[PDB]
Design a protein around this ligand. Structure first.
Ligand SMILES: O=C(N[C@H](Cc1ccccc1)C(=O)Nc1ccccc1N1CCS(=O)(=O)CC1)c1ccccc1F
Ligand SMILES: [Mg+2]
Ligand SMILES: [Zn+2]
Lengths: 237, 63, 49, 82, 678, 25, 577, 226
RNA sequence: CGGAGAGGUA
């Protein structure tokens, strides 16, 4: 059959890393059908890269403090966990961070291989206020969604390894809402108001496009069962 | 006598008022409600209901 | 009122009403009861014309 | 420090109450200005007599009271109590 | 409204009348429950308003003796051995004896099992007495309740207030298009339906000869015949529908006293006032907030809660002093399109659809040609199908009143589906209006994909002390699903006293739990613990009576199990279609030029004294002034305001209302010299 | 175990009652 | 500030405006054609109606109108149906539930009437109770249950914080609430599990801010480590930006205190928006709180029989002593009313101790949403003592609970009591209205007329009388006697300087300073001593409880006083003095 | 930690009008959302056919009775509400039913034209004793969702026409279950199993294909950004 | 729509 709404997508920019999209003319009941699937695809489908594990020289047994560094170990973990990185090589890579003497350790003080890049060189990591030294090596991988720390059952390779939770997805937060969008003798048409917040490695529009692509691919599986079955057509733009 | 008669004991109040030839100054909420006049309270007070409004000189010039 | 004066009867009435209402767990400010009690004490009885 | 007001709750009442001594003064202020605007609109079909039209860009179908409140909020008027 | 309402109306005792009490002056001690009411007047069923305690209902077993005193049966006991010899005692006679309860253990004969028995004494007093001092005994544990109160399952688990509400609200249910009897009843429904008289009963034995939707013919054994006519789509005193349906075949043999046709709220001869619905007892997004209810859309698609209502309209043609006002199709200054539905005589045709403002009977009156139009119209908010016309003409020697020639009557019927604002209710005093009606696609559903028909909030159950609805829900799920007690090695100890034939059941089994002698808690637990699987072979409700649901909007399973089951819901005659009213202008009273009051009069909403107090407390002077002057009785202000609004102008100022002038004229009539000084 | 046996064509509704009724309504 | 208005009722209320607009837009040539078009409800009237009703306030009223907030103004919006849609947060003000109630709608016409309805009477402007100042438009019932569930910490939950064990670092610390929400979505974390979070958009408490930032301030965007649950972060994200972080379980009283603080420190628009957000969150989380009712949830105390036997032994001993010559009838009755009162108390205590803390009934009662524990004891314990037609307790108790089912002789007396209560309620509601009318009539002409009479009289309020051993103990009834009052004389302590100046609102900070300084009694201004000839003055009356500021010069305070006194007359029971 | 396996859909045929479809592997947490999206589309937006109105010979409205049949016409409407018909036309078509004398009137007595077909003969409509004749004309039409009866005033019809509520939903019951695989190496994935049961008018494969087409059409707009 | 009565809802 033929629909009589032809939904239209609109965007409102609230920041360089935050937008608010709207799909106004949706048939009654298709706000919730689309919103949850779109949110899930945004938050768990787009691939990315993150730090998977680290090893700090000078701390092997007790993870309490690093000599010569003001901040304890957990603060270093949280700071490295907030690093925005992009990787192309499938296999894990290994970075290195080392600054000597007094100063401020920043995300820009690391030299990644040609296959990796850092999108926030100004991020603060640690401060050396005791004429000390810092030496930590990072492991970066590719993945999708949020993956908690994977316990190191095989510790033979190294005993200083500290696995960390990986936020692979470049989308940080998403929410949606549904309202009413008609007055022509009908007050039951749905609205959809997504509020996408993303990292510095991708804009919300690209994330939305990728989510739409993935959902189309997923539902092509169902569509292939009977290609001539009757559905609903929105029509040409 | 109007407010008293509208409250209770209409007959007694009316007979006493008639005998005494009482005159009712319509200064009250219930009396103004009865006669359909603006109550002397809230926005019906003289200082409020007699406000005068006009555009400022600069706003008038900006027209 | 005849023995102690108007202020004493005012406080007496306010306290009595407030305690009757407090026994049930209802909170009313004293200014409303004061308005009513003020309205109750407005006249004087004549003795010598 | 508040989300954008929507509907009858715009402009904020707290902002409006700074312009006047009381809420009753605001009521009479806005009512009289709305009457002036309505008289202007009615007489415009015949001719200008004594009134001034909206001092702010009115909406597509905005009503006189909303225009009066907007004019009061954006300081453009003056009133004197009795 | 239904058979139960009339049956309870006939069995009613009222204390107020020409020689009785006053509805206002009556004190608090004449409205109380007296110890002598036990078995003669029901303590539960009374009104809730000013008539609380002044109108009561006769008990089930009570009767009145020649002098007019209510009696009640008691079972005589001799030497502590309960015999079977019923004697009727008045209250004064009963006060001289001590009578035990029906729930007194017995040992297969009259002998009392226990050595001491709890008995009732003179002035509402109970004492333990040796079994040899007992005089009488109740005939049942339901001797004190009435007919309507005996139809509430698990009554003893409900507080008095909710039981009173439920008994009252069972008499407000509207007949539905299709009826079905409860899964869990009490047994006081077959006799309630038969004695009410809305069903058709076979007077004599015979074999059904011909059966149709209009009649039944019975061939008696002695060769005689009797034909019963069914009243189809009749109208009750309250606008409901009274339709009777045969429930016998063309070759079946009937017995004397057997039900031969159904009635409004009857299903196979049993009272059926509602429908069985699958309920959930969770709070849902605030739509069932503060006694509101959430419904599925299946109940609208499948006409589960649909009703038929019938209206009656009539007009008459008088002689008049002017002369001879007539009913005809020739109405001046009316388009020929507006007269399409009218027939040659001047009345609408049966089967025609009528809407608000439509013509029902064209009539013209000679106001003096000067003949005006005084036809019969369809009132505001009324529509439906014309299903019948009755016309009485004096020319046909009809017994019409003096001065009228025609008395045509028109009936229009309409089917009403359930909608937001309608009032539902269970049998345990639980009530609420329909807050929302959800699509089937976004209702909580069970693991097999079964949506729930209704959702009730959790916060109303424990506070109101009516926990019998949860027990009814549990037993309703047990009955709908079926069960089988696994007595492979002796019956379980919790089923020792459970009657045989109750150790096994098939899906959709009808059971009864009498009012004070029914199912226990241990038996309910046992039945819940052993129920048959569903079609696939899975048990959806566990031993606690709680199921795991899915969220229909997001698809996630709810974190904790919810309580699901079946309960009996009734549709009350408090539909929102009869309560919506609005007005801008209309009729005004003549003595004082104020708007009329009444929905049927197209009246206005009264702005009483307490609303004036509220407005004065707000400080709103202009609003109150306009309400009192230009909206009520300012004769010129009304027209000026209407003109100003229909133009672009602003409202004018008010004037003196007419009621003040009426007051001044009355005061002058009292010989008082009232003057207005200036 | 059923509820009523006096009315000829009555539905078979099974009851949980444990007490016998000497007298009919 | 919104209400749903049926389309069919809106078409009739706004008939002249719709006719005018139909004529204006050329849909009709004259007014008669437009009138007929409206009468026939032709498809061309709904589009104009939608725009006609825009920003036109509408008054809603529910009878009985016991106090001022029984009438309020809203902004209509057309809905499909024939029932009016009412906001859940105004039911307490209206006293309206949804079991069949009906309301009336009124339309203001003139410019002044619309201005009054839009400023004075708007629903979002009336949040606080004029009688006491407590908030009336705050979460209740389902919302309270949802917020209480959300802001609760359950020890040993999923994804809980774990200290370092010597072989792995600390577990359960997140770099932002977004990561915590992702973990909760994945099922690795619980909304009610204690964690450590880094926060940058939430203001730290006073202690943390003082000991962590100092002088400069929080300056949004500064990171600090919090030790709370995720539900508490979610709750605090619903409050204003500058409000300090609240780390507590949200009993109804905590929410009421939060709302009072917001009302007294923020503009009312912020308060209205905050209550709307709290409504949304509470309704969302009440659905997922897992509160239901089943006979498995109605736990019975495990040792009721033992307690009942223990106290039945005492009753038997007393009865046999009466049978012997030792005490008369009245002594026996008093002794038996005792014993059974203690048995009821002991059964209640055992029931309370048996129940788990997360039981739906216990959660609903303890959350402050609705109900009390007497009903819980009656439902799951035993009803207890009943009363005779004279009101005195019967010496025989009702030992059954409604979970077990009262017998036929324990139901008869229960029904007697219930009907007696209903009749008494009817008589009390009839008796209270007469008193309210008399109170309104006596004091209907008490109106604020001046700003200050400059009188030197006043009254003395105890304000936390001192202790014998030497200490200041706050007077329990201080908020209805000392708050919202103006000082009549300067407050001085031990020959020191003035603590509070003359003419001070005397709020919480002032009272706390007075208590700290060591002064008990203070003289205040009261209407009892106002010197104005007609009416009262603003300073003598003091703060307006609804507004929180000095009362205006046109306010009618007598009617407010009468409505405040008379409204809670049905709650106040009609119980030789 | 990047799985490069795409999902695949497979079917298991339990019976003629019930089947199970299995979709795996999926991202952890995505099974429920996809399953519920499919379920909502299946339950709400699948086109079908239904009877729009009828016209019985000697009746003028639905509040009346036919002489000789034991059901009032309202009960006949309720019984007819259970018909399942498949229509291949795109415009209304009329079916005819005729019966005389003793016997039972069932759904197998209807005579449908080319295209339309009745799928449940033996449904039951009414019973005629000796002197009852039933002649009802039915109109079949295509659509989707639930459409209440269209009154004669709006359609400009005669007095004998009786509008009837239409239910154009070929699907009967839908449910899903998700099997999760949570191993300690974080190589997690989901498995979705969807059960579709239709009322014999179409097969579950066709319903799933219709839902897939609808969802692809809807989600193609969000991908237009690129 | 003037009056009287009866019943019901919150
Ligand atoms: O008292 C009980 N039940 C009696 C049972 C009874 C009903 C009717 C006739 C005779 C007896 C009662 O209902 N009385 C009665 C009923 C209505 C009004 C007054 C009375 N009373 C109270 C007991 S009173 O002070 O002695 C004298 C007056 C009872 C039974 C079991 C457990 C606890 C109980 F409190
Ligand atoms: Mg109510
Ligand atoms: Zn003063």
């Amino acid at each position: 059959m033929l629909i009589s709404q032809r939904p239209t997508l609109s965007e409102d920019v609230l920041t360089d890393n935050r937008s608010q999209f709207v799909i106004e003319p949706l048939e009654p009941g298709f706000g919730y059908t689309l919103g949850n699937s779109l949110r899930r695809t945004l938050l768990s489908s787009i691939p990315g890269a993150a730090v998977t594990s680290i090893r700090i020289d000078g701390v092997l047994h007790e993870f309490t403090t690093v000599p010569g560094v003001k901040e304890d170990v957990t603060e270093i973990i949280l700071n490295l966990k907030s690093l925005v990185v992009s990787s192309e090589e499938d296999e894990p890579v290994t970075m290195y961070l080392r600054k000597q003497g007094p100063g401020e350790v920043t995300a820009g003080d690391i030299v990644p291989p040609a296959g990796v890049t850092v999108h926030n060189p100004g991020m603060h990591i640690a401060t050396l206020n005791d004429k000390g030294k810092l030496e930590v090596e990072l492991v970066v991988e590719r993945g999708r969604g949020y993956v908690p720390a994977v316990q190191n059952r095989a510790s033979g390779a190294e005993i200083g390894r500290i696995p960390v939770d990986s936020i692979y997805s470049p989308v940080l937060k998403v929410t949606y809402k549904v309202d009413a969008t008609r007055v022509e003798q009908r007050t039951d048409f749905d609205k959809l108001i997504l509020d996408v917040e993303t990292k510095n490695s991708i804009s919300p529009r690209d994330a939305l496009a990728s989510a739409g692509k993935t959902l189309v691919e997923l539902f092509g599986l169902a569509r292939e069962l009977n290609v001539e079955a009757e559905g609903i057509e929105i029509g040409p733009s | 006598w109007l407010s008293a008669a509208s409250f209770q004991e209409t007959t007694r109040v009316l007979t006493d008022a008639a005998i005494n030839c009482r005159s009712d100054k319509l200064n009250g909420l219930k009396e103004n409600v009865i006669i359909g006049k603006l109550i002397p309270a809230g926005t019906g007070i003289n200082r409020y209901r007699n406000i005068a409004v006009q555009p400022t000189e600069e706003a008038r010039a900006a027209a | 009122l005849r023995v102690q004066g108007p202020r004493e009867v005012q406080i007496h009435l306010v306290r009595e009403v407030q305690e009757v209402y407090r026994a049930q767990g209802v909170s009313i400010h004293d200014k409303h009861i004061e308005v009513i009690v003020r309205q109750m004490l407005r006249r004087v009885t004549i003795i010598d014309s | 420090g508040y989300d954008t007001p929507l509907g009858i709750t715009n402009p904020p009442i707290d902002e409006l109450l700074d312009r006047v001594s009381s809420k009753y003064a605001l009521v009479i202020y806005a009512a009289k200005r709305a009457r002036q605007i309505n008289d202007y609109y009615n007489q415009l079909g015949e001719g200008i007599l004594e009134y001034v039209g909206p001092l702010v860009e009115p909406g597509l179908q905005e009503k006189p009271l909303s225009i009066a409140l907007r004019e009061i909020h954006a300081d453009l008027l003056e009133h004197t109590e009795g | 409204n239904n058979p139960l309402s009339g049956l309870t109306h006939k069995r009613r005792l009222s204390a107020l009348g020409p020689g009785g009490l006053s509805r206002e002056r009556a004190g608090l001690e004449v409205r109380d429950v007296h110890p002598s009411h036990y078995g003669r007047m029901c303590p539960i069923e009374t009104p809730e308003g000013p008539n609380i305690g002044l109108i009561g209902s006769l008990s089930v077993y009570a009767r009145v003796n020649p002098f007019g005193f209510i009696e009640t049966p008691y079972r005589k006991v001799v030497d502590g051995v309960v015999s079977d010899e019923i004697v009727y005692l008045t209250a004064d006679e009963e006060d001289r004896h001590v009578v035990a309860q029906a729930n007194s253990p017995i040992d297969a004969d009259g002998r009392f099992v226990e050595p001491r028995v709890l008995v009732r004494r003179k002035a509402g007093e109970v004492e333990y007495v040796p079994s040899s001092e007992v005089d009488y005994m109740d005939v049942s544990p339901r001797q004190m309740v009435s007919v309507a109160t005996a139809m509430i399952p698990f009554l003893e688990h409900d507080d008095a207030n909710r039981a009173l509400m439920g008994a009252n609200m069972q008499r407000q249910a509207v007949p539905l298009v299709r009826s079905e009897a409860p899964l869990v009843g009490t047994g006081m429904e077959l006799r309630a339906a038969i004695d009410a008289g809305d069903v058709v009963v076979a007077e004599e034995s015979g074999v059904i000869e011909e059966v149709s939707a209009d009649y039944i013919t019975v061939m008696h054994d002695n060769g005689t015949r009797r034909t019963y006519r069914m009243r189809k789509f009749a109208r009750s005193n309250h606008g409901t529908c009274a339709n009777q349906c045969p429930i016998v075949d063309a070759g079946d043999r009937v017995e004397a006293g057997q039900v031969i046709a159904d009635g409004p709220c009857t299903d196979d001869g049993e009272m059926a006032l509602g429908k069985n619905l699958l309920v959930a007892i969770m709070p849902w997004e605030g739509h069932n907030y503060e006694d509101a209810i959430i419904l599925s859309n299946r109940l609208v698609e499948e006409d589960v809660l649909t009703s038929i209502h019938i209206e009656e309209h009539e007009i008459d043609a008088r002689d008049t002093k002017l002369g001879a006002e007539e009913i005809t199709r020739d109405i001046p200054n009316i388009s020929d399109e507006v007269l399409a539905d009218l027939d040659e005589r001047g009345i609408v045709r049966i089967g025609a659809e009528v809407r608000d403002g439509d013509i029902l009977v064209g009539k013209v009156t000679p106001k003096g040609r000067e003949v005006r139009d005084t036809s019969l119209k369809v009132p505001h908010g009324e529509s439906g199908k014309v299903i019948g016309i009755r016309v009485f003409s004096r020319e046909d020697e009809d017994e019409l009143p003096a001065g009228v020639n025609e008395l045509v009557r028109v009936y229009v019927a309409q089917k009403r589906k359930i909608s937001d604002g309608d009032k539902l209710a269970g049998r345990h005093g639980n009530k609420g209006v329909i807050g929302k009606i959800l699509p089937v696609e976004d209702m909580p559903f069970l693991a097999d994909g079964t949506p729930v028909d209704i959702i009730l909030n959790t916060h109303g159950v424990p506070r109101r002390m009516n926990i019998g609805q949860i027990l009814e829900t549990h037993l309703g799920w047990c009955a709908h699903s079926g069960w089988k007690v696994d007595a492979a090695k002796g019956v379980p100890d919790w089923a020792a006293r459970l009657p045989d034939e109750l150790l096994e059941a098939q899906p959709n089994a009808i059971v009864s739990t009498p009012v004070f002698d029914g199912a226990q808690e241990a038996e309910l637990q046992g039945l819940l613990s052993c129920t048959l699987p569903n079609r696939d072979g899975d048990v959806l409700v566990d031993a606690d009576g709680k199921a795991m649901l899915f969220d229909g909007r997001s698809g996630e399973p709810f974190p904790y199990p919810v309580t699901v089951g079946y309960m009996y819901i009734m549709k009350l005659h408090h539909l929102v279609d009869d309560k919506i009213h609005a007005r801008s202008t209309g009729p005004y009273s003549m003595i004082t030029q104020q708007p009329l009051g009444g929905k049927a009069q197209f009246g206005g909403q009264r702005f009483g004294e307490m609303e004036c107090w509220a407005m004065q407390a707000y400080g709103a002077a202009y609003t109150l002034q306009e309400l009192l002057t230009i909206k009520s009785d300012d004769t010129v202000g009304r027209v000026k305001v209407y003109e100003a609004i229909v133009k672009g102008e602003n409202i004018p100022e008010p004037g003196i209302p007419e009621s003040f002038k009426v007051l001044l004229k009355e005061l002058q009539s009292l010989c008082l010299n009232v003057e207005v000084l200036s | 175990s059923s509820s009523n046996n006096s009315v000829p064509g009555a539905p078979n509704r099974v009851s949980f009652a444990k007490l016998r009724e000497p007298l009919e309504v | 500030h919104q209400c749903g208005l049926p389309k069919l009722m809106a078409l009739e209320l706004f008939k002249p405006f719709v006719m005018k607009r139909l004529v204006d837009l050329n849909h009709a040539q004259n007014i008669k054609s437009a009138k007929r078009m409206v009468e026939r409800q032709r498809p061309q009237v709904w589009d104009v109606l939608e725009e006609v009703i825009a920003e036109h306030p509408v008054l809603l009223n529910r009878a009985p109108t016991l106090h001022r907030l029984g009438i309020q103004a809203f902004e209509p919006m057309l809905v499909e149906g024939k029932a009016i849609q009412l906001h859940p947060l105004v039911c307490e003000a209206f006293n309206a539930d949804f079991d069949g109630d009906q309301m009336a709608v009124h339309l203001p016409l003139s410019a002044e009437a619309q201005a009054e309805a839009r400023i004075l009477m708007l629903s979002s402007n009336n949040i606080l109770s004029p009688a006491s100042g407590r908030p009336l438009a705050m979460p209740r019932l389902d919302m309270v249950t949802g917020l209480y569930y959300l802001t609760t910490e359950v020890p040993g939950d999923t994804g809980e914080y774990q200290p370092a064990s010597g072989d792995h670092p600390e577990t359960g610390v997140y770099s932002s609430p977004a990561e915590a929400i992702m973990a909760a979505d994945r099922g690795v974390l619980s909304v009610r599990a204690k964690i450590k979070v880094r926060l940058t958009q939430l203001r730290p408490p006073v202690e943390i801010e003082a000991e962590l930032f100092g002088h400069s301030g929080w300056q949004p965007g500064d990171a600090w480590m919090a030790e709370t649950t995720l539900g508490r972060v979610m709750f605090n994200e619903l409050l204003p930006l500058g409000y300090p972080f609240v780390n507590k379980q949200m009993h109804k009283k905590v929410q009421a205190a939060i709302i009072n603080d917001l009302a007294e420190r923020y503009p009312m628009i912020v308060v209205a928006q905050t209550v709307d957000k709290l409504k949304d969150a509470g309704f969302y989380w009440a659905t997922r709180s897992g509160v239901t009712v089943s006979m498995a949830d109605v736990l019975v105390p495990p040792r009721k029989k033992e307690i009942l036997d223990h106290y039945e032994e005492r009753a038997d001993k007393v009865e046999k002593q009466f049978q012997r010559g030792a005490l008369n009838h009245d002594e026996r009755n008093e002794a038996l009313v005792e014993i059974w009162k203690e048995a009821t108390d002991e059964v209640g205590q055992a029931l309370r101790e048996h129940y788990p803390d997360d039981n739906p009934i216990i959660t609903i009662v303890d959350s402050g949403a609705t109900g009390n524990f007497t009903q819980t004891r009656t439902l799951a314990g035993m009803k207890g003592l009943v009363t005779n037609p004279k009101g005195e307790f019967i010496p025989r108790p009702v030992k059954s609970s409604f979970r077990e089912g009262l017998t036929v002789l324990e139901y008869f007396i229960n029904t007697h009591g219930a009907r007696k209560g209903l009749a008494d309620t009817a008589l009390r509601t009839a008796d209270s209205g007469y008193l309210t009318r008399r109170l309104v009539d006596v004091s209907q002409d008490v109106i604020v007329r001046e700003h200050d009479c400059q009188t030197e009289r006043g009254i003395v309020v105890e304000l936390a009388e001192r202790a014998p051993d030497g200490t200041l103990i706050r007077d329990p009834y201080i908020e209805t006697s000392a708050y919202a009052r103006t000082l009549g004389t300067d407050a001085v302590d031990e020959a020191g300087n003035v603590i509070v100046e003359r003419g001070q609102d005397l709020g919480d900070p002032e009272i706390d300073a007075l208590l700290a300084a060591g002064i008990t009694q203070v003289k205040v201004r009261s209407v009892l001593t106002c010197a104005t000839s007609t009416g009262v003055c603003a300073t003598c009356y003091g703060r307006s409880m609804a507004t929180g500021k000095l009362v205006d010069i046109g306010e009618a305070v007598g009617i407010v006083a009468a409505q405040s006194i008379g409204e809670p007359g049905t709650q106040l029971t009609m119980r030789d003095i």
